[PDB]
């Protein structure tokens, strides 16, 4: 038992609920949120910037640090970093950006950073200003994700999309 709420159980594992990642994760304060990152880690907009927003600099602060250090993530990669007052941790994802050209079927591999912890709050990888087809993300990560994954959907009309037409 754990102290999501209001989420629409999509599969044995996955979840999915309207709401925003950033008021979510201020609620429940889960062990691990999800950002959509690049591999720059620049928090700019989407998900991310709004997340950093939230933190008030301090994940972009910390970030450009890991950058400093260890360089750009890969493409399909993540790295653990602190989770601010939102979360314990934050798992910074990169999924492909369709909008820079990146290959889309890296998103499995972006989604099978998920299954190194037990249970997560998340975006859609690859989303939003990452220009990918939300479907399509929602089913690449019902087959790869086994671990507990809450999905927070921003757009309600998106919301209504995804469930109606899930398979
Ligand atoms: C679906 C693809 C998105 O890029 C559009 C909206 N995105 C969000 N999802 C959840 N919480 C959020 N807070 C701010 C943005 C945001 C993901």
Same mark, same amino acid.
């Not at 798992?91 to 369709?98: D, I």
């Not at 709050?121 to 479907?135: E, Q, T, V």
């Given at each position: ?122 975006? %859609? %990888? ?42």
């Amino acid at each position: 038992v754990n102290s999501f709420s209001g989420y629409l159980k999509l599969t044995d594992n996955v979840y999915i609920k309207n709401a925003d990642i950033v008021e979510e994760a201020k609620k429940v304060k889960p062990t691990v949120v999800v950002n959509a990152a690049n591999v720059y880690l620049k928090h700019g907009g989407g998900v991310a910037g709004a997340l950093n927003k939230a933190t008030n600099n301090a994940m972009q602060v910390e970030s450009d640090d890991y950058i400093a250090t260890n360089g750009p993530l890969k493409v399909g990669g993540s790295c653990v970093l602190s989770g601010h007052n939102l979360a314990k941790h934050c798992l910074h994802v990169v999924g492909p950006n369709v909008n820079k050209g990146e290959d889309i079927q890296l998103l499995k591999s972006a989604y099978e950073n998920f299954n190194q912890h037990e249970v997560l709050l998340a975006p %859609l %990888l690859s989303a939003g200003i990452f220009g990918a087809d939300p479907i399509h993300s929602l089913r690449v990560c019902v087959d790869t994700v086994r671990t507990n994954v809450y999905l927070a959907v921003f757009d309600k009309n998106l919301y209504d999309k995804l469930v109606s037409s899930f398979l």
